[PDB]
Scaffold this motif. Sequence first.
Motif, PDB file in Angstrom:
ATOM      1  N   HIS A 175      19.771  12.489   4.146  1.00 28.62           N
ATOM      2  CA  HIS A 175      19.615  11.499   5.444  1.00 28.62           C
ATOM      3  C   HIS A 175      20.607  10.479   5.207  1.00 28.62           C
ATOM      4  CE1 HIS A 175      15.907  13.639   5.618  1.00 28.62           C
ATOM      5  NE2 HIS A 175      15.242  12.999   4.950  1.00 28.62           N
ATOM      6  N   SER A 176      21.979  10.710   4.865  1.00 30.65           N
ATOM      7  CA  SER A 176      23.076   9.948   5.080  1.00 30.65           C
ATOM      8  C   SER A 176      23.889   9.713   6.062  1.00 30.65           C
ATOM      9  CB  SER A 176      23.908  10.545   3.867  1.00 30.65           C
ATOM     10  OG  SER A 176      24.681  11.489   4.228  1.00 30.65           O
ATOM     11  N   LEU A 177      24.364  10.575   6.703  1.00 24.88           N
ATOM     12  CA  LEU A 177      25.108  10.695   7.812  1.00 24.88           C
ATOM     13  C   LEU A 177      24.209  10.322   9.039  1.00 24.88           C
ATOM     14  CD1 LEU A 177      27.013  12.451   6.054  1.00 24.88           C
ATOM     15  CD2 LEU A 177      27.928  13.314   8.355  1.00 24.88           C
ATOM     16  N   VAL A 178      22.830  10.611   9.163  1.00 24.66           N
ATOM     17  CA  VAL A 178      22.241  10.423  10.279  1.00 24.66           C
ATOM     18  C   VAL A 178      21.727   8.700  10.085  1.00 24.66           C
ATOM     19  CG1 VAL A 178      20.189  10.894   8.770  1.00 24.66           C
ATOM     20  CG2 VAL A 178      19.621  10.654  11.288  1.00 24.66           C
ATOM     21  N   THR A 206      19.850   8.618  21.997  1.00 27.14           N
ATOM     22  CA  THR A 206      18.862   9.637  22.009  1.00 27.14           C
ATOM     23  C   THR A 206      19.294  10.856  22.098  1.00 27.14           C
ATOM     24  OG1 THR A 206      16.899  10.040  23.637  1.00 27.14           O
ATOM     25  CG2 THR A 206      19.035   9.580  24.734  1.00 27.14           C
ATOM     26  N   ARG A 207      20.626  11.208  21.876  1.00 23.85           N
ATOM     27  CA  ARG A 207      21.111  12.644  21.954  1.00 23.85           C
ATOM     28  C   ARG A 207      20.759  13.163  20.643  1.00 23.85           C
ATOM     29  NH1 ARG A 207      26.125  15.333  23.049  1.00 23.85           N
ATOM     30  NH2 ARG A 207      26.648  13.688  24.468  1.00 23.85           N
ATOM     31  N   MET A 212      14.839  25.781  12.923  1.00 24.95           N
ATOM     32  CA  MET A 212      15.583  24.767  13.504  1.00 24.95           C
ATOM     33  C   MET A 212      14.572  23.699  13.782  1.00 24.95           C
ATOM     34  SD  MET A 212      19.203  25.730  15.108  1.00 24.95           S
ATOM     35  CE  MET A 212      19.287  23.924  14.912  1.00 24.95           C
ATOM     36  N   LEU A 213      13.210  24.246  14.349  1.00 23.65           N
ATOM     37  CA  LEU A 213      12.255  23.008  14.832  1.00 23.65           C
ATOM     38  C   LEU A 213      11.806  22.199  13.571  1.00 23.65           C
ATOM     39  CD1 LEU A 213       8.913  23.922  13.900  1.00 23.65           C
ATOM     40  CD2 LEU A 213       9.821  25.802  14.936  1.00 23.65           C
ATOM     41  N   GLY A 214      11.774  20.989  13.774  1.00 21.89           N
ATOM     42  CA  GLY A 214      11.421  19.763  12.937  1.00 21.89           C
ATOM     43  C   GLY A 214      11.848  18.396  13.397  1.00 21.89           C
ATOM     44  N   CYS A 215      11.660  17.522  12.489  1.00 21.24           N
ATOM     45  CA  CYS A 215      11.969  16.087  12.814  1.00 21.24           C
ATOM     46  C   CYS A 215      13.380  16.140  13.034  1.00 21.24           C
ATOM     47  CB  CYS A 215      11.716  15.174  11.820  1.00 21.24           C
ATOM     48  SG  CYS A 215      11.707  13.407  12.462  1.00 21.24           S
ATOM     49  N   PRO A 216      14.002  15.461  14.138  1.00 18.05           N
ATOM     50  CA  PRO A 216      15.458  15.607  14.307  1.00 18.05           C
ATOM     51  C   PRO A 216      16.256  14.420  13.730  1.00 18.05           C
ATOM     52  CG  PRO A 216      14.317  14.529  16.048  1.00 18.05           C
ATOM     53  CD  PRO A 216      13.159  14.976  15.284  1.00 18.05           C
ATOM     54  N   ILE A 217      15.718  13.962  12.691  1.00 14.45           N
ATOM     55  CA  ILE A 217      16.497  12.812  11.766  1.00 14.45           C
ATOM     56  C   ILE A 217      16.898  13.697  10.579  1.00 14.45           C
ATOM     57  CG2 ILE A 217      15.347  10.919  12.710  1.00 14.45           C
ATOM     58  CD1 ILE A 217      13.791  10.613  10.275  1.00 14.45           C
ATOM     59  N   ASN A 218      18.289  14.366  10.640  1.00 16.11           N
ATOM     60  CA  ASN A 218      18.883  15.198   9.617  1.00 16.11           C
ATOM     61  C   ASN A 218      20.338  14.988   9.786  1.00 16.11           C
ATOM     62  OD1 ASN A 218      19.005  16.766  11.349  1.00 16.11           O
ATOM     63  ND2 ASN A 218      17.732  18.444  10.508  1.00 16.11           N
ATOM     64  N   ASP A 219      21.244  15.548   8.711  1.00 22.65           N
ATOM     65  CA  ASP A 219      22.452  15.404   8.697  1.00 22.65           C
ATOM     66  C   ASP A 219      22.867  16.775   9.988  1.00 22.65           C
ATOM     67  OD1 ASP A 219      25.206  15.560   8.436  1.00 22.65           O
ATOM     68  OD2 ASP A 219      25.259  15.826   6.309  1.00 22.65           O
ATOM     69  N   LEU A 220      21.890  17.625   9.544  1.00 22.34           N
ATOM     70  CA  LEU A 220      22.123  18.883  10.547  1.00 22.34           C
ATOM     71  C   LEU A 220      22.567  18.624  11.885  1.00 22.34           C
ATOM     72  CD1 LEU A 220      19.435  21.370   9.100  1.00 22.34           C
ATOM     73  CD2 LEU A 220      21.753  20.960   8.238  1.00 22.34           C
ATOM     74  N   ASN A 221      21.803  17.569  12.582  1.00 24.95           N
ATOM     75  CA  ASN A 221      22.087  17.362  14.121  1.00 24.95           C
ATOM     76  C   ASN A 221      23.399  16.874  14.459  1.00 24.95           C
ATOM     77  OD1 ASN A 221      19.700  18.145  15.540  1.00 24.95           O
ATOM     78  ND2 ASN A 221      18.686  16.255  15.016  1.00 24.95           N
ATOM     79  N   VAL A 222      23.844  15.933  13.064  1.00 26.05           N
ATOM     80  CA  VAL A 222      25.585  15.680  13.483  1.00 26.05           C
ATOM     81  C   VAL A 222      26.488  16.713  13.086  1.00 26.05           C
ATOM     82  CG1 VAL A 222      26.987  13.511  12.575  1.00 26.05           C
ATOM     83  CG2 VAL A 222      24.556  13.252  12.688  1.00 26.05           C
TER      84      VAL A 222
END
Lengths: 308, 308, 308, 308, 308
Positions: A149-152, A238-239, A264-274
């Motif tokens: 949870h660094s980049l997020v 919010t993106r 891919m479903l889950g809580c959207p706070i992760n480096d993966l989204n960025v």
Amino acid sequence: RLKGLRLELPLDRIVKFVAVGSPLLLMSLAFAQEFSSGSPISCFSPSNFSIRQAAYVDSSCWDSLLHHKQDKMKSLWPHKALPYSLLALALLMYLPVLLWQYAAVPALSSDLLFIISELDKSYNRSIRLVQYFEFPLLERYLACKQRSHSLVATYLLRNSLLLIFTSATYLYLGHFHLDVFFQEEFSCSIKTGLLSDETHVPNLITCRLTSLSIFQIVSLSSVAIYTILVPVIIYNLTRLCRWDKRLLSVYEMLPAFDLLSRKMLGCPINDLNVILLFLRANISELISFSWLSVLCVLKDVDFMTLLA
Amino acid sequence: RLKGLRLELPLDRIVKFVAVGSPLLLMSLAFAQEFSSGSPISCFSPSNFSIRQAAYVDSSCWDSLLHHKQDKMKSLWPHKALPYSLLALALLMYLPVLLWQYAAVPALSSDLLFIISELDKSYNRSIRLVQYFEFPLLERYLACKQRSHSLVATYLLRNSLLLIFTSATYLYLGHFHLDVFFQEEFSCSIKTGLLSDETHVPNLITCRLTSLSIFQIVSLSSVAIYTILVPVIIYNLTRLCRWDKRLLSVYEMLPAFDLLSRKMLGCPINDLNVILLFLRANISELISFSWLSVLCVLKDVDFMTLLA
Amino acid sequence: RLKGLRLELPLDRIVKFVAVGSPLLLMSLAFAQEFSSGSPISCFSPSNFSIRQAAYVDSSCWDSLLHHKQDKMKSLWPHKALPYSLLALALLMYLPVLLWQYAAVPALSSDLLFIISELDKSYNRSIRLVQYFEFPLLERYLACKQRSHSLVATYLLRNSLLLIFTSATYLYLGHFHLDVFFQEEFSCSIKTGLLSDETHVPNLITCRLTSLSIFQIVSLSSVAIYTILVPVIIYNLTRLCRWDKRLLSVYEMLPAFDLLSRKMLGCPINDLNVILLFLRANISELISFSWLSVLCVLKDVDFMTLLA
Amino acid sequence: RLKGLRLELPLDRIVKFVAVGSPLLLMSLAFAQEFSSGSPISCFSPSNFSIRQAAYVDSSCWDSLLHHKQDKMKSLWPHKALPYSLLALALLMYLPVLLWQYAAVPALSSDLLFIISELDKSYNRSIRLVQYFEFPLLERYLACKQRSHSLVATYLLRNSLLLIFTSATYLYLGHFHLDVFFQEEFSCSIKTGLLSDETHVPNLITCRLTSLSIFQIVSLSSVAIYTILVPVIIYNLTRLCRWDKRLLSVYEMLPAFDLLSRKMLGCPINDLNVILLFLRANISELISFSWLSVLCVLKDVDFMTLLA
Amino acid sequence: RLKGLRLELPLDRIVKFVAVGSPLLLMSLAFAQEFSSGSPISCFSPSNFSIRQAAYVDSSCWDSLLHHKQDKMKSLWPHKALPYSLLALALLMYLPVLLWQYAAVPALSSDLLFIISELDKSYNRSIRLVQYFEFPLLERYLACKQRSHSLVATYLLRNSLLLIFTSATYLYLGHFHLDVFFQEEFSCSIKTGLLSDETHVPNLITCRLTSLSIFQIVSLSSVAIYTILVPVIIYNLTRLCRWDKRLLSVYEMLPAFDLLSRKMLGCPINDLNVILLFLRANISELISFSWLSVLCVLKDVDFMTLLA
Ligand SMILES: *[C@@H]1O[C@H](CO)[C@@H](O)[C@H](O)[C@H]1NC(C)=O
Ligand SMILES: *[C@@H]1O[C@H](CO)[C@@H](O)[C@H](O)[C@H]1NC(C)=O
Ligand SMILES: *[C@@H]1O[C@H](CO)[C@@H](O)[C@H](O)[C@H]1NC(C)=O
Ligand SMILES: *[C@@H]1O[C@H](CO)[C@@H](O)[C@H](O)[C@H]1NC(C)=O
Ligand SMILES: *[C@@H]1O[C@H](CO)[C@@H](O)[C@H](O)[C@H]1NC(C)=O
């Protein structure tokens, strides 16, 4: 292609550019329309004063900037601190970005380079195979990144800092620039100190501020610009809250990419989204991602098994 | 050749260039002819006033810009807001273009590169074959593009935004700059506020505006320039309304291109029209499209079966 | 060699350069000698006026620019509109050229490149053959070009537009700048409007224009320059009216070129004349056209059958 | 990659950049707002003085800058020495850095180049071997470096010099700029010297300093900036006090690197800490250190014995 | 590597840079703070003088710069010659360096290039041999250089010239700028010459010098800067007096280098010391001298006979 990597979305870049350039534009306007006509104050000194004494009264009232309503001692400081204060704001607008340049650029750049190299290797492997299927390195790296949870954190902190600075500017304008916003003329007394016993000068001298309209325009421009800017920051924040489902079928072009995109479903706070947002911003690498875009557009036995 | 791609028609580019440069030219003229002669106001202060008091009256009447016709309180604000207001207009002229740069440039560039690559491949295949005929990838891509409405939407939105901004400028000029267009001199009173009880100054002081002619010329230039500019925008908008039939026989140079151009008749709101216009603007790629132009010009057994 | 193509004759280029630079030179002279000495007007205000009142009279008479001969109300507007008006002229001088850049440059460039490539191919073929004769592609292209009337239309339209603009400038100078050409001093009244009932100012104040000589010199320079420029435009227009017979024997160096030049007689309004003029301007391509020039010069069994 | 070596941490570089640019920014502000309004002093000369005598009194009181409170003879020197003094501070901020550029750059650069070459060689050897183990040269060099105290001495000396300079600035501001921080107006006598017997001038002339607010703002900005800067210097100093344990498991990627990192525990004053910090700052050499970062991130039979 | 040769030590270069830039910085300060406020003199002309007569008195007293203490005729010339005189000093600071550029650069450069080529050849020979021993050319060249006294003479002469110039500046400041260092105001008489019989002007007019503080600061800065600079020059001079024993064991890395360094003891005035200092400054040629530095550092059977 490798050297053309972008470290921020075009919308975020243009928002930062506007938020930095607008205070500097107002600074240029202030320093151009303030000292090209003398000083932003003209004092109605009596007729018996000589020119030098009138200039002294002008300078003294400009420095004091006091009001002697009648004993009330309201001050009119902001008109003299309007440029310099805004300069701090400019530095504030440049504070989070430097943070973004010193907290996420190296790790993001390294991860993007590694990901693009692995994507090229996987594309070449698929090209060879269509004429082994799964990647353990990429799977392990994605599993690790789904936990960090660094980049997020850096992204949310930068956006929160910018929003907090905008709110602080709102509070400053709404607390300091409305009790003065209708001050055309004010009294000023130079009968404080050594000149107390002098009888050659009046007790109260009226002075009208020249730059009142300029200050009003500057304040209105600032508030309007930041009102226009805040919703875009809200949208950029919010993106991250919504997963990149719009391209999920794109990941279906390779079943290995689908397996990487499994669960891919889950809580959207992760480096993966960025990472997904940045690779979406990098879907024009040299020609290969262009071909991927073409095939995913036409997809909406496919293309005779990819032209065999 | 690849790096020389143009993202807009020369007429649209020159129209945008004019619409952006004209307000900036007027800005330069205003800031050059306004503060090179002092302030755009001269006040006929009485003879008994000293020079400092006359300057104070000048500055106060310039800031107030009020009219005391006789109680009528008509204002003359635009003469002081003429530059800054036009600056907003300049930004407005730069608003849609940025939209065009952030809503259609990447997709159009990718599609143009893919189309030019496929055109080169088809030309090479035809050269080999004259000494298999149909392309399924191009056919599917054209079928998909005949259904999408993205680039056409962006183009129409940009043109509509520019037209709306021009209409807004028309309304502004016709609602704010004709009630002032014949104001040579106006009264001004500084007997409001602390100086109310003073008997050393007259009740009404006349002042004539120096920059009246400059303001008139600026307004006339703006309205004339935008009147000249609007019909070209109308023509650029209606260009999309008519299909590119003028080059249909050009597509006859290859029967595969004709089959791609089969059933071109239909409603002209599609990406295909924009793609056709851009490829028409790109009929000089390196040498090959020049040869295509030569052969289609001479066409109007052909050329002994293309020189065998 | 290919990148060194010229899109206009040197005489036409220098004529355009002069016609554009002369108004800009006069603009620089006006803005340098006008605001480096204050304002182009000095008003003989009476002795009882203070300095501020004298400056107000100066500014008011400069803005009004009215004459009260005695009620006659002749105006002296051009002295204040002399720069800006000429600026329009400058834009006018840049109007046809842009047309030439957006109506004939691409087609002419493509045709010139194709023609130069075919000329190189024909030269190589002749070199091989001296140690099949006729070209059908070139013959068909020349036959087609002898029927089209596009480039000739653009050339004649550009020259006619330039001539019309010069005639309009002549009419402007001969209709507006001779009723003012001998106005040294003029009366001016500020007793119109609010100051009507004032008795502190005279009814008529004389003022002499400072920039009269500068305006006279500018007008004379403009008329002389355009008088010198018009005959060269006439010559450039009539150049198309006469066929390029001076190089006909040059086309005799190859009988194929002679056959292309068969039946050159006819009405001289065609693309062929412009193409011939441009290729004459391009008789120094790399070395080959230089050799052609040498052989045609020495021609005036030849050269032992071209050195065998 | 080799030419992109960095000789300082980004935090230290930005701290030096701020500490150098802030005094120069204040210098620009002072020289812009001091001599664009005349001199930073206005003297209330009596009415009987001519303009030249008033200017002489102004200049004399500006030069003397004495106070005649009543005989007290307090001086107000800093207001005239505010720019130049700060200039020395700027040079002071540039003193240690030059030391760092002339006491540690060559040795550090040579050691970094040798270390990076040996790291590349060891990586290649490991790549060959996975498909002899220990390095005696690197072991001996690390043993020697664990005994030397040169680079650590230079680093600590530079940081101590910067801290001492900041403390000196604190002492200067707290000892010279608070006995003057509330001096609006002061008396001044020109009745010293040849004019002693003159009776045309008063004994005491009051003068108010124009640039009081500017001086106050400059002092406050300086103290605030250095207060913000000092804790980062403290953190950069204490970074050396703690060993680079955060990457110890990283050294576990190769057992040879672990043996080099055997017995890392000890007193943290050695060249090894600086070398570790710089190599951590250089973990993106070309692609190889990026792969090392990826593998150490995913580590937190491994990766099927490094993909065999 | 060859083109990166340095012709002077960094300390000597920075000393020369400071000694040249400081006078030019003071020149900029003088020409910026002297003519941005008029002239560095203000004269208390009587009230009956007009403005033109006061300006004439000002200019006459500025030109004369005489003192009429009472007949004493002390002059105050330096205040008017302060810039120009220092300019000569600047040229003086640039005199020896040009000498160094025109008396030792070519020979030193040629010798350094030859020595570096021979060092590379000897390193290659040793590399071949470890897997004939003595050099007669180098031995003869070193024997010849141990007898010549050219470069040492140039170095000592340059340092002596710089020291002599600094001493001359010390004498100038201590002989001309302390009899004037406390002159605030001085009398001045314009009753010499044609105006002798005039009765409209007083016999003695007092004038106070505006730039007294600036001159004091300039003098103090000059003396302090040169006091700081002289000990470094002394150290650079005495560096030659001690042989380069600190690297003698370095020469032990090759017994041939030791034999070249046999009998290094002797009188330290020779070219050999300068050559040793320059090669020490060039111990980072490309990579080889870096390896030499590494091996000599680790030296303090060696390294298993240089890795065999
Ligand atoms: C000038 O007028 C003021 C009133 O503002 C008065 O106090 C002063 O005595 C007058 N001085 C002279 C010389 O008339
Ligand atoms: C100057 O004239 C004005 C009239 O505008 C009058 O009110 C005022 O009293 C006069 N003052 C003097 C000193 O003559
Ligand atoms: C100044 O002279 C004008 C004549 O041009 C006269 O009307 C006015 O009354 C005079 N004023 C004074 C104060 O002498
Ligand atoms: C001017 O006023 C001063 C008082 O400050 C007095 O000493 C002087 O004598 C006066 N001079 C004249 C000419 O009125
Ligand atoms: C002006 O004052 C001076 C005294 O410095 C005196 O010599 C001169 O005669 C005076 N002139 C007039 C016109 O008052």
